[PDB]
Structure formats: structure tokens, C-alpha cells
Amino acid sequence: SNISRQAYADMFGPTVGDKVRLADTELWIEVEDDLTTYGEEVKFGGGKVIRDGMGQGQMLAADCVDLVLTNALIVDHWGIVKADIGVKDGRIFAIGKAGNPDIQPNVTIPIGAATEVIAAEGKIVTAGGIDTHIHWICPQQAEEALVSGVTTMVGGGTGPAAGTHATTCTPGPWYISRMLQAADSLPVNIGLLGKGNVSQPDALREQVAAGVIGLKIHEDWGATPAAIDCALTVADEMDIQVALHSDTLNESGFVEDTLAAIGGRTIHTFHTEGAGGGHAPDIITACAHPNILPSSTNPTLPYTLNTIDEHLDMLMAFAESRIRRETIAAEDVLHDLGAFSLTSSDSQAMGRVGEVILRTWQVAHRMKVQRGALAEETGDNDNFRVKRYIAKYTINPALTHGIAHEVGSIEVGKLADLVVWSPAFFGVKPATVIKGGMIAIAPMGDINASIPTPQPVHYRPMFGALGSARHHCRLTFLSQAAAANGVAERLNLRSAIAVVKGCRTVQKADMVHNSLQPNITVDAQTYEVRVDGELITSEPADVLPMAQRYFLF
Amino acid sequence: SNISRQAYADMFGPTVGDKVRLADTELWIEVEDDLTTYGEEVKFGGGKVIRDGMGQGQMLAADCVDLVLTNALIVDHWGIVKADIGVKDGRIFAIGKAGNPDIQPNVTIPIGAATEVIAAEGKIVTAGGIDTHIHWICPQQAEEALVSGVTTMVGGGTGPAAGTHATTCTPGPWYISRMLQAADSLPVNIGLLGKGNVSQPDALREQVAAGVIGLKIHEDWGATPAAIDCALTVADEMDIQVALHSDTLNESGFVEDTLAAIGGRTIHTFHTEGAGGGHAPDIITACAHPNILPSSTNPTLPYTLNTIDEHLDMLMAFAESRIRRETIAAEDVLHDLGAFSLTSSDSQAMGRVGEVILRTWQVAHRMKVQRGALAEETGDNDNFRVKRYIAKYTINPALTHGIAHEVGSIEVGKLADLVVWSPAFFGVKPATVIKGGMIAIAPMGDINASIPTPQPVHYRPMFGALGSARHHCRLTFLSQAAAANGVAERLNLRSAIAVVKGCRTVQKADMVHNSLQPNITVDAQTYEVRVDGELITSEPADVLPMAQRYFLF
Amino acid sequence: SNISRQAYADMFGPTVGDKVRLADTELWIEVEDDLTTYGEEVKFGGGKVIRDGMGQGQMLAADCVDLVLTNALIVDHWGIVKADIGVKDGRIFAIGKAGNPDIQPNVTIPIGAATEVIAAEGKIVTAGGIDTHIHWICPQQAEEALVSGVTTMVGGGTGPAAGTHATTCTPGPWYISRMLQAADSLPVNIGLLGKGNVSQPDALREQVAAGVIGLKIHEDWGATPAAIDCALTVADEMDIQVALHSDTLNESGFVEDTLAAIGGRTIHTFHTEGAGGGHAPDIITACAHPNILPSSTNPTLPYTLNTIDEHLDMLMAFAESRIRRETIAAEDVLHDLGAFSLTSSDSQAMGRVGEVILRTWQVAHRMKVQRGALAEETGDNDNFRVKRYIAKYTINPALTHGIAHEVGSIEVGKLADLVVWSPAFFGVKPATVIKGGMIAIAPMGDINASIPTPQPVHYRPMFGALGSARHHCRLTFLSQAAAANGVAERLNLRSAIAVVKGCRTVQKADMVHNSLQPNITVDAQTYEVRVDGELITSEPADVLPMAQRYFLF
Amino acid sequence: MELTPREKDKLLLFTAALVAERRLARGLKLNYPESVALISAFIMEGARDGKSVASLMEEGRHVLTREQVMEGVPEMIPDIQVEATFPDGSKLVTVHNPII
Amino acid sequence: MELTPREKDKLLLFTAALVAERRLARGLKLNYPESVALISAFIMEGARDGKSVASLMEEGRHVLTREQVMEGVPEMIPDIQVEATFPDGSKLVTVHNPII
Amino acid sequence: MIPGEYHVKPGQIALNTGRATCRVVVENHGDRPIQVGSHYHFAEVNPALKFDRQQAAGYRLNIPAGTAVRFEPGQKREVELVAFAGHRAVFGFRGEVMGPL
Numbered sequence A, B, C: 001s002n003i004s005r006q007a008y009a010d011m012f013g014p015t016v017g018d019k020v021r022l023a024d025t026e027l028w029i030e031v032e033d034d035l036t037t038y039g040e041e042v043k044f045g046g047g048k049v050i051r052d053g054m055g056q057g058q059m060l061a062a063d064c065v066d067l068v069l070t071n072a073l074i075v076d077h078w079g080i081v082k083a084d085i086g087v088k089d090g091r092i093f094a095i096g097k098a099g100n101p102d103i104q105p106n107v108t109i110p111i112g113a114a115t116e117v118i119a120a121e122g123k124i125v126t127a128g129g130i131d132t133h134i135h136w137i138c139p140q141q142a143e144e145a146l147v148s149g150v151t152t153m154v155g156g157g158t159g160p161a162a163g164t165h166a167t168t169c170t171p172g173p174w175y176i177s178r179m180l181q182a183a184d185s186l187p188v189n190i191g192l193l194g195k196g197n198v199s200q201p202d203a204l205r206e207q208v209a210a211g212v213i214g215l216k217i218h219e220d221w222g223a224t225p226a227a228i229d230c231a232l233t234v235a236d237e238m239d240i241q242v243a244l245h246s247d248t249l250n251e252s253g254f255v256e257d258t259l260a261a262i263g264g265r266t267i268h269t270f271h272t273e274g275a276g277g278g279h280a281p282d283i284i285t286a287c288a289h290p291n292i293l294p295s296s297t298n299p300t301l302p303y304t305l306n307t308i309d310e311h312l313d314m315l316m317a318f319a320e321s322r323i324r325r326e327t328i329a330a331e332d333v334l335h336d337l338g339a340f341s342l343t344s345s346d347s348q349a350m351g352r353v354g355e356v357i358l359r360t361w362q363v364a365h366r367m368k369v370q371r372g373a374l375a376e377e378t379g380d381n382d383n384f385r386v387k388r389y390i391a392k393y394t395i396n397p398a399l400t401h402g403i404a405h406e407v408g409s410i411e412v413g414k415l416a417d418l419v420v421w422s423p424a425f426f427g428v429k430p431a432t433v434i435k436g437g438m439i440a441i442a443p444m445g446d447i448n449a450s451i452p453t454p455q456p457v458h459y460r461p462m463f464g465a466l467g468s469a470r471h472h473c474r475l476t477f478l479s480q481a482a483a484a485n486g487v488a489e490r491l492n493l494r495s496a497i498a499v500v501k502g503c504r505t506v507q508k509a510d511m512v513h514n515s516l517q518p519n520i521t522v523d524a525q526t527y528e529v530r531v532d533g534e535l536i537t538s539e540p541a542d543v544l545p546m547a548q549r550y551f552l553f
Numbered sequence D, E: 001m002e003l004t005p006r007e008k009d010k011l012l013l014f015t016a017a018l019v020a021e022r023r024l025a026r027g028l029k030l031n032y033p034e035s036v037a038l039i040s041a042f043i044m045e046g047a048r049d050g051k052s053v054a055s056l057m058e059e060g061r062h063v064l065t066r067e068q069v070m071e072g073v074p075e076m077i078p079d080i081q082v083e084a085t086f087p088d089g090s091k092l093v094t095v096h097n098p099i100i
Numbered sequence F: 001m002i003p004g005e006y007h008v009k010p011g012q013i014a015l016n017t018g019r020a021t022c023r024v025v026v027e028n029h030g031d032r033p034i035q036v037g038s039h040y041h042f043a044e045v046n047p048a049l050k051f052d053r054q055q056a057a058g059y060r061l062n063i064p065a066g067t068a069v070r071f072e073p074g075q076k077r078e079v080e081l082v083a084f085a086g087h088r089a090v091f092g093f094r095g096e097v098m099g100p101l
Ligand code: NI
Pocket: A245, A270, A271, A276, A277
């Protein structure tokens, strides 16, 4: 039997060689591989394949996956392939060919009576996003982020308090405890950051032992060389990550002094470009060092017509020293080259919590338009650029904070945090958001309707976000010390617990597709950014995709 | 002393002989009996009867009911009577005459210091509805159903997944466990259905042992004779119910073949008419058998002008074999005759979750208009028709799934799940919804207002739907096996637990007021339904009551 | 160095001698004292004071406060002073001068790494309000009250039931238990009232032992001399408070008879003016007795043009005996003189749950306008009037119900329930509401915005109102007996527990700034109120502040 | 704006009234919720203008007549109640038998 | 009014449509959510007037044309579905390729 | 057609049939109004009401349950009483009986 590739694409989604446009951008992905056996694809429906004795086997629950995402077009740092996805015990079981071994060939993902089915033919499946720059200003941010496709949130705060408005810090044991408890009510995996600004190591150890998976050094609390050193010392001791927002005022020294204080120790620099904070006007030079894991906040991504104008007030003498067109324009290119490895929000403190994914793709769109194909690109597609950019908000953030053994990518053994997208709405509005094996939130039509599709259709929380179900499907990250001291039992945390590790050994070279260490310099007077003497710059966009075509406001 | 019957009706509600119009329909009920003693009725208010030493006695909490619904007009399968209702320990204590035995005569329901009062004079009180065809596509369905007056929901699903969109199945142990846990957050009693489509009995036993109170056989998973037999075998073993959605395609055989496979064993046939699924075009003939408990989904109730037109797309060659004007028109009459015993929704999979009660009464209205009084009717009222129809969504569903020992009717010892209605809004918008002795949801006006009546008035959750209170007032149904294996403790379920029993011994004859087994045939070419050779049909309604007069949209 | 007082006021808020207008009223407060050391004030921000080694010390968590509210203008019954507030372990640690003892002088509140900061410069900080007349008609009332600044709610009810609509009673053990459990879900401290109307003491003891912190005597349940006596006897036994709503009908006797029945025992008279219930037309004379703690409900505060007209229907022969212009006008003055000690709502039963604070200040505004300065006033300010009126909804209610050891005022050792206000919106819309050391609710702008200030800005729940965090920050009040019998463990209550004590020993003299016992009489025919023969009256307001300038509807 | 729950709650009533207002304009006979919404919104705007409670209790009975609403609707609405912020604070306005 | 969840839910759609309606009036080319809202509200009012399902399925395809919406928008909307209370109860109206 | 309308059959209802009744003249000597409810023990009403208390022993007002009779200051009127039933045990009110009778 034969079938035209078009009819095939309509029935089971695209296959090897077929290209798909990501939303309304100019980025095109091409299916690199297909793990199916033509003619043996699994489809669910009346008279279709997944039925007793046919595509569904006679095996017991222990011998079959709990969930199968059929004919999914995976987009991950390791590849863009067409395959079936098996989920078991809340984790990624396998990526391959689903079906019944009794009558079907090459079945690697067994479907049985205990198997639920999610039809993904014609859909793009990605790992949940991970935002490592969250200001816990309000609990509502969690749902906003979940809706956008971000399944893990790392940050600090106690609520709408002055300290939190400005920094990602959950100050001391009492607040840390309270926030760990409140975390059980939120539908995303969470990790907290404590206040790392202190020159007494015991004050820091207490916080780590209390539960935080990292320490935030912020200039508002005093980002001095003494404070920085003290935080890194405790970090090397307790295997936790340090996030830095350097001395913008150059009060205690310049950028090189801070770099000296850090002493080659691992550190994650927040908003490395500078607008969101850091030594004026050259904190961006930090991305040249091997021990630096650099990320960007999202208001500056990408450089557009209104960027500069809006930034002055979101900030409001050091304003015009902080907001620079030169470094802002360069930042986009540095992302395209792999010099900047992560993207984050900086939620409600110069950042948009639900625009991390959206903005990263807009930067990719703009760079393709301005610079063309990347040197690593093969074939007539943007596969490598896509892999480079998706890594910025998935695997890299996960490596940076020592949680990549649990989440960050679609790999066997990791927690099943997946986002299903329709090509037309990729990176803007997802079709399904799965937390730990359960749909946590998805667009839903009229509740009293005969079908789930009638209007109005808006995102509503599902069973994966309800009480005990939620606890079983989310993770609360603790520091090894906190886990050992039995914090989870003492606070009576009800969610699953995961411990962070490998925060001190990760380096720039470990950043997937984003390990560039450029010989970058910044002119002290003109603020011009140069890599190997070449000027790095770009043009501001007048109109962007993934914008006015999708939003009501 | 004397008092005119009209003034009496205004003060304590109607009495023996008085008739009341159900909403804006043509159905009239007549008060058959009154359990009061004229002059000794209990009324609450300033200077009224329920006061210390007067209508309120000096007994301790153990010797008086927790709640009394005064002067209620009960409408149940067993009668339409005027009486006081006593509720104790979350259950129905008694139906009779409330008051203080110290000074009042014939007091059967003692009112004391521990007695709360709900004024029901001029109100109709009914048992909470029970929907046995729920697709757990989204948690929001629970509130929608509660608002309509449905207090118990039986079905399957894991959320907005392809399998759930199509079938009422909660596939395997893991999903079953997760959904049982999520159930603790919903304000309705719940029972889950697993995937019954498999030819290996152990795969089914696992699900029953996991927690399900039934198994759903759906053609989308393969409703073959082998699968059907395997499900029924396990059902007879574990005392659980089987719900069937037969082979529409006639792939494995015709209707008679399926009937053969069932082998006289008890089975609940979903949407027996056919439009919602089943052997084309004669699955409706199933209602002639004694081992069949037949129910209808609600989109086809009642037959109207737009019915056929809307159904084609809600379905979208076998479309015109599935959607038939002939069987649809006959279905209404079969309900009026007692050949179809239950009504359900088929929520968001060709059914409206909040229209189960509403549609059942519209069918009754239309049938009275077209066929006049029933042969069982006595007096100039529609009492019997009302009792026949109310049984369709209360007691019958409860018997069908082995939970009638807990809910389903207003009888002593059963869980106190009651709905208070104002005659003008009967079956459309309830005045109060009581779950296990506590008001779970009711219409509420301005929260800052001087009284609870100012606008805007819309349904809002009450204390009976809050945290631990909710757990104490709702029931999670488990299979005898699951209960024995200690599933509730293992999953740490916080709600009350009830076990299903008597699912295999119930038969068509046991259906209250709906035990007709007609000699029904369906013409293979014309699709005409005939009972004893007589053609069964009806006319489509152009306008219906309980519609545009009550809804804003 | 020097600085102009104006620039100072703009930077750190007003200081000694500076006056501030409360909202849009005519009431002016003057800063009486300032606990700072000019030049050593603590400010948070980039380059500001609270930074490592500077305003932030090197002490461990145990040696520093968890939270500091900087440069706050406190307004409390004991004073209107400018100072820093330290909060530790969910309680008020100290009021004084915050900072780092290493380099700063006079530091009494230590700031360390574990210290979160809330900037209160230019803000007024007050204790959370306490409403002792709550009808638990619906859970939504809790959020409404919290938003207004009321952190503690005392009352009774089971939901929208007839008994609750009319009285503040949670009838019997079963309902009491259920409501205690439901309380864990609400973001305010709660205490329940049982039905005190019974002539059998054991029926009352059961309720107290069940969990209630008081008993409500309501005429609708029979406010007879026998019932009253029985309730007070049990009250003196179990150390709980009695709330009274006397016999309006004069059925069992007149006001003097009720007073006789009470026999000099402590009792809290609800809505003492009369409109909301009580002996017609002289229940107001109750405020002359030493054992009476009198309060007002809020619909009558203050006397305005529409007051009388609206009241007839909110009530609907004894209507015109209950609603009297004479007693209503006098009530405002009696409040100004300190004859009436408390203010409450009477939520949804002739009272507005979110207008307790707002109305109290409107009465103060109107009285200043009509009567000028109080005799106790010193200086050209309204400091004493402010202290007299703020005590009416904070400390006095707390003393009246035996919970002043936990809440009611901003004093060391008490639970940290504070409300931050901007002068322009004082008593109308608060900036921050802190429950037990955590922000429970506050106005919040666009969740996806770059800052928390963009529109729309509306009150949204914060972390202090989430799951376990909420439980750790709220209090459930139990009677000593209930606490002893282990009710909290039996019901498995998850919130913190506090026990009431000192309810029988409190008297009119103990009411802060409101201990006046006037020789008051009421003319039986004309209803005119006279104190020492002088006529007490006032003029109805045509327009009031804290009204149309702040609300959208 | 710092909208409180009650302000946001009234926004619902206001919008419900917009629905009715447009349908009345089309020449349709209003149903139960439409009528209640329309008359309520009228009174709220009345309090905004500063009319007295006494005045609105009367004016509210002339918003919709029996010929502008579906059969039975008038009987389903024995009265309408709503609160709004008058110049002198929140007040309850009760219109008895608003539709005649 | 005793508004049920579904009635309140539709109020959202109605308001979403008001937004689109005003922008269409300004002469703007509508985007994805604006289009879906506008056409849906049209059908709801249609059911209020009492038009049949059959009639609305056709009428809905003439509310917005390809020249009144942003590029790609028509392709993003293969169909629109909404339910409303017809004189004979709730019915589903599905408009296929509403924008041409 | 009126949604939820009643169709009350014409006629009357006889209240408290077969119970001993008695009439008494009552006069309000107080300066404030007094209102009594249908089930209140009449012998223990407000002391300002002058009447034969001894005859009112064990009796309440023979009127529709829930209603009440009002006595303005100085008002004199004849009321009909009906005897309590049940155990005929009186508890509460002004605390004058607190036991059977
Ligand atoms: Ni920063």
C-alpha cells in the first residue's frame, strides 16, 4: 500500500524531510528522524489502532506505560525527531515506537489496559521551561508561568515586600520555612534562593541548612568583595549555586575587582548585559570567563524600537549609565553566538514572567533575519539555531542550578514535565502542559458544552494542579544539608522532594550549544562592545512575530 | 381558631390537595400528604415558634437533630408530601413533625440548642442528582454539576487527554490513584471507572483492586466479544458494574452478537438510543432485556427542531447511520413508558454536564403535552409522571452502580445530600445545595451588603465545600477489594469512604417506576422503532420551558 | 549636615510636630514622638543603608528580627509615634530603632542576613481590626474583611441557613466541629459563638467543650430571663463571653427586667442603639452599667440623609418602634463621648462586613465637624479623638472577648497582624495586610508586567494566605475546656491555637478611652435620649468622606 | 485602582446589564436575569449621580414594563435590591414590584 | 439573577467581543482572539433572537472577511464553535471556515 | 402561566383542634408596647400585662403558629388561649414553672 506524503502529514504529522514554520516567525525546523515503522503508527479513535488485541496489548500495568504521546514531533537540544513518547511513574520511560508486541513490529513502548493516550500527531512536544530568576512578589506568577510553558521556577521572595521587589532573596530560616510550605500549593517545581549578602559564613550556612538551593548576592544588600567571597566559600562547601547582581555604582571596585573576588569559582551572573543591574557599563565582559554561567533577563530581548524609552522609567544619573543602546544591541548577537547561555524573566522587577519562552524565540527570529544561517547549520533549515535557543531555557538553566538530573530535557528517567504545542502557536500559547505525568493546565472551552472546544476557551487548571494530585506531581528542591537535617519532615512538606547537586563543577564549557567564551571588550566612554576588535551590534525591530496576532491586549 | 387555605399556603407552604406548577412547565404536582398537626407547625423568626421552652426543647445534642428543614414539600420516588426533615450526623434522621415534646404533640424530630434551622416553607426539597456518565475532562465540571443539583458523579478520565475526551476511562493503577487523590478537592461524591477493554482478566482485577467501582467498555478501545466477556467475568467476581458503549461499526458482529457475549449478565448500557454510540442502527433494542439497565445521555433529550442539525458536527459515512431522527424521536416515548430507566450527561463528549436534571423535566413536559396522562396516573395531577422521571436521575442510577445504600433518595439513614428549590425555578436554578449535612453551594448576593440578597446574586461555594469540612461531607466510593487492601490509607485519602455492593444482582425489574421490557424492534432500512408492531414516534419541539426565561446566555 | 524638614518628610516620612490628614477627612494627626537618631535612619535600596557591614549586621538568625518595617508612622491607642518595627517568629518583637550595632548607635532592633524589609516611610501602620459580630453566612466575607484591614473575626453561623441569616450562632457540637475545620481555610483569626438560648446548662457546656469561645443570646431563639441567666451561669464557669440581642417585643419583660436577669454579670451587648435589635425603644440605656461592654453595628454609623429610608426595608408595626431617628442620632455622640466602646459589622444581617473601619472614621469626622475638639484633646490636632476611635475596633473588642493577650494592638509579644496604609487611602484601601508575620493580601498590578505597579491593580491573595503557610500565620481560638479536651487534635485542626481568658473580669472601666457610664434616659413616647437631662442629638450628613472619591461602584 | 472584591463583583452586574441593554434595544422581550441586571445597573448609576434612596425606590419601578418582558417574568421578581456608594456612603435600595 | 458558572463564563466572551467590535469600528484588521470573540458573540445573539442552528451556521461565515483580519488569521481559524440557549434549549453551532 | 404558581383549593383550616381553650381579658399597664408570640407560655409574659395569671397556667395564644398579638400601652383586649400539649412540661420563660404543669 502507498500514501502521498501530504495525506500522510495530515494523518500522522510531518515526517523525515518535512519542514514546519514555528508560529508566525521565519524559523523553520526540518524533521531529522522518524522512529516509526510506516504502516504501524498508533492512532486512537473509533475503529483506529489502539484497541484490545490490536495496538493495545494484554500486559499488566507493571509491563506497560501509564501514558503515551502518539506521533509527537520532539524539539529538544539533542534533536528534532518524530516519535512516540512513553511515560511511566511520572517520568519519561522511553522515546520510540509504541504499540503491541503481539502483532506489531519494533515496539519499544508497550501500550496496555493501563495506558492513557494523548494524541500528538501534528503537534510539537518540548520539555517544560525553567526560569531561574523569579522574584516571589505574588503567588499568581506561578500560573502565569505555567501557562507559558515554564514548569520550574527558581527564585526568592516573601511576597510584595520592599526587599523582594528588588531582590530574589528569601531572608533567613523563618521565611524560608514559610515559603517552602507555601510552595506545596503551587503547580510548578520550586527552588528557593536565600540572601547571600553577609560576611559571616554561619549566617549563610543556616539558610542553606534551612532549605535554600542557592544564595543571591544583590547590590541592594551590598555586593561587596567581602560578601561575594563569603557566599562562594559556603557554596563550595554545601554544593549550592550563587546568583550575582554586581555593584552597579562601582562603589567597592570595578568589574575586574568583582571578577577577582570571585576567584575563578563557579557563579551564575544574572542579567549579564547590565540594564537589569551590574557594574556600569561593562558587566557584560563577564561572559568571557570559563567559571561564569551567564543569563539574560527578558525585557531587553530582543532589541526593538521602544526598548530604550520604556526602560528609563522601569528604572527610575546612573540611569543613562545603566541603560545603554550599545550593550543592549550586542546582547542579541551574543545570544546568537552562544556567549550568553540562559534566558530568564526577572519577574515583576524588570522582567515579564510569562514571556521567557516567547522572547527567546523572537531573538532567534530577529537574528536569522539579520545574520542569516549560523556556521554550525547544515541543510536548508534552522535546526541548529533552534537547538541552541531552546537549550537557553531548558537544559542550561537546569545544569546551572544542579537540577538537571530531574528536569530540563526530554530524556529517559527525568520527570515528565512536557508542553504540547500546535505549530501555529508555538512558544505563545500551548495546547497542553503536563506536570509529572499529569495535565496541570490547558485551554478549556465551555464547561457545560457538548464538547471541550466551544467558546470561551481560556486556560483553566486541571487535575494535575489539584490538592494531593499536585503534590505527587511537583518537586520541591532542597539543599543536600536541608534534606539530611530532615527539613521536609519537620515542616511537613507534602510534595515530592529533590536534592540539588553538581552546582560547583558546572562551567561555561558544559553549557549545551552555548559555550562560547569571546575575547570581548567594552569602550568605557562610548560603551561599544567589541569581540576580537570587531564591533558587535544590531538593528532594533519595528515589528515582531508572536505579538499582535495572538494577544487580545 | 381558623385560617383560610390561601393565607395558610403563603405562611407555611401548600398542604394536602394544593397543586404547584413545576417551573414554567405544564407539569403540576399535588400535595398527597401532610405530616403536620395544624397549629403546631414550626417557624423560625422573631417571636416565632422555634424558641427556648417553646418549639425548642431542653435536650442535649445527642437527643436532638443537628438540622431541621421546616415545612418542606418533598418530591421523591416514593411520594410528594409536606413534612419537616431532620438531619443528624450528616445523614437523614427522619421525615415527620419537628418541635419540642415538652409542649407540642406528635413531635418525631426533636429541636434543641444544637439545632440549626433551614426554612423550607414554600420550597420543594429533593435528593441530590446522580450522574453516572462523567468524562473527567476538567475539574470545573464538578462545580457546574453541583450548581444544577447533581451531588454524585461517577465516571472516568485523567483530564483533557485524547482517551478521556472519547471514553469514561481512568486507565490503570497510577492514574486511578492520582484521580482518587484529586477527588478530595471536589465538592461532590465520586466513583471512578477504569478501562475495561482487555482480554486478560488480571489487567482488570488490578484496576478494581486499585480503586475503581466499575469498568467502561468503549468501542474506541475495542468493544469486542472477547473484551466484553472478560470484563463481565471480573465484574461478577469483584461486585462492580460494567458500562457499555458497543461496536457502532458492527465490526465484530451485530447487536445480537454483543447481547450474546453479555450472556444475561448485568450490564449498564450507556446512551442506549444510539446517537452517542452503539451498534448502528439498533442498539436501542437492548432495553427489552431483563439484565440491561438502560440510560440516555442528554443531548437528545428532548427531541427538538435543532437536534439533528447540531448532532452531525458534534460527531464529525457512519454519521448518518448513527444520527437517526427515528430512534431519537422514539427515545422520548420510551422514557415516558419506563423502558429507559436513567438519564445522564456524557459531559463534554456529546453531553451537557449541567443539564441532566433540566432536560429530564423537559422530556416529561413534552410527553405530557403529546401523550396526555399516563395509565398509572390517579387524580388530576402529574404525580406519577413526576415520580417516574425523578427516579431516572436519583434512585435508579444509585441502584445501577451499587451505591443506593448511601445516596439516591430522601430516606432515613442515607447521606444528607439535598437540594432546595423554589417552585418557579425547579430543575433550573436551586436555592440551596446541601452536601452531607452542610450547604456546599448556593446563590449569594453582594458580600459587603447589609443582607445576602442584594445583586449581583450568583452561585458561590459555601463552607461545605471548604477544606476539611468538605472532606467530612463528601464520599469517595471504592471497590470492596480496594477498601480491603487499604487503598484509602495508602493514598492517604482524606474524605469519607463508601463501598459499592449489589452491582451484579440489580436488574431491569428493580428500576423504580422504570421496569418496562418492551417487545421492541428496529427496521434495518428505515430505522423505524416499533413496540409490539406499533410505531413509536413523537414531534420535535420548537420551544421548550426551562430555557430562555431563565438564562442570560 | 542639615536637611530641610520638607525634604526630610519626603525621604523618611513625617517627624515630631508634622501633621498628616487622614484620607479626605478633616481629622489631622500630629507625630508625637520619633524614636530615630537623625542621620541614622535605615533605608533600603541600591546604595542605601541596609547593606552588609552597614545597616545590616553579622548576627545569626536567632539574634536578629525576621522582618523590619522601616520609618513607620504608628497610630495606636497608646500613641502616634514614628519608629521602626521589628517582627520575629510571627510576633511583634520591638518598636524602636533598627540597624546594625556594629556601626550605628541606639539600635534596639537588629537587622541581619535573615531580615526581610518592608519600607514604611510615608506610611501609617496600625493593628489589624477585630470584628466581633460576624454572621458566617458565606466564606467570602473573610476576604472582604481582610481587604478592609480586619484580621480577626468572631461570630457564628453554618452558612446561608435561616438560623444564621438571623443570628450569630453555630448550633451544637457537630456544626461547631465542621466550622472549626473550615476555619483552617480562611486567612483571618477566628473564634466561634454557639447558641446560648436554652434553660438547660448542660446543653451549653457541651457547646463550650466543643470549641466555641462564646455564646450568643438572640431573641429569635428566645431571649427570655431564664435563657439569659442560664447562659451567664455557664459563662462564669467556663470563662467565655456572652453576646446579647435582647427581647425587642418586650414579651418577657422590659429593658430593666433583662438588666435584672443579667444581675451585674459581664455581658457584651450587640448593637446597643437598638435598630439592629433590642428592647424597643430603650435598649440604649444599657451603656450606663459597669458590667456592660456596648458595641454598635455599622449600618447606623454615621447618621446620614438616607439612613432611615434604607433601614425600613432592610428590616421588613414594630418596625417604626425599632427604627428611630432619635436613638440613631444620639448613638454617634455617645461614641464620641466614650459611652459606646466598640464597633462591629453584623455582616449580611444588617451590617456591611467591609465597612467597619471606614464607618468608624466617618463618625469621628462627623463628630469633629459638629462638636469640635474633645475635652481630653491637647494641642491643635485630633490625636485623642483618633486614639479613642481606633480603640473601638482593635483593643476593646480584643478585651471584650478575652483574646487581647494575642491580638488587638501593636505591642511587644502580640501576634504580628498589621495593616500598612498610605495617608491618602487610610481606612479605605490598605497598602499591605500582614497576618502573623506574612503578607496575606495586598493590591497587585499586572502579573506579567515588568513591575508590580501596572494596571489593573486589585487586591489579590499572597503567600500568607496559601495552604500550610496560612495555617502557620492564623489563629483559631478555643475555649479553655475545648483546648483541654484535645479538640484541636481530634478534629485535626492544622492552624495555630489560642485560648480565650479573662472574659468574665473585663468591665466598662477597662475599655480603653471608652469607659464612660452616662446617666442616660430615653423618653418612652418621644424616644428622645438624654444624658443628665441634656438632650443628645446630631445632624444627618448629606455627604461623607471615604466614599465616592475612592469607590468604582 | 486598588479594586476591592465588591467593586470587581459589581463589574459583573454592570456587564450583565450591558447584555440586557443591547437586547432591549433590538426590541426583544427581556427574560429573568436580563431584567434584574438592567434595573439594578440603573439604580447604581442613580447613586453615582447622587439621587436619594427615596427617589430611586420609585424611579426603579419605571425602568421596564410588563410589555417589555417575557410572560411570568414580572411575577418572578417581587422586588430588586442593590447597594451602591451614595455621596453619604453605601445604602440599600429596594424596589418593590419593579415591573408592572 | 442567580447566575450559574456557565452564564458568568459567557459574560467573558461577550466582553471579549466588545473589545473586538470597537477595534473593527476603528478600521483595524483584527487578530486571532479578536476574530474568534466577535463571530462567537454574533452567534450567541442569534440564538437569543431565535434563529435556527442551520441559519447561524451559514450567517456566521459572513461576519468577517479576509480583508478585515491580519494575515494568517483565517488559516488559524478552521472553524468556530459556541453554544447558547435557543428557544428549544442549548445547541452547538459550528461555523466551518468562518473567514473567507 | 406563572412559573411555580400554586393552585390552592378554597376553604379553611381549623387550628389546634380538640384542645382545651379559654378566654381572658388582658390590659397593658406599661408605658411601652408588648408583643406576644403564639407559643410563649402566657402566664409568664411581661409583668406589665394585667390579667388572671392563674387561668393562663399551661396555656399559649390560640393563633396561627408563628404569628403574634400586640398590646400598645394602655390597651385592653380579650384573647383566646389554648393549652400546651406534649408532656406539658414548662421550662424557660421567666423561670416560674421549670417543670411539669
Ligand atoms: Ni538584579
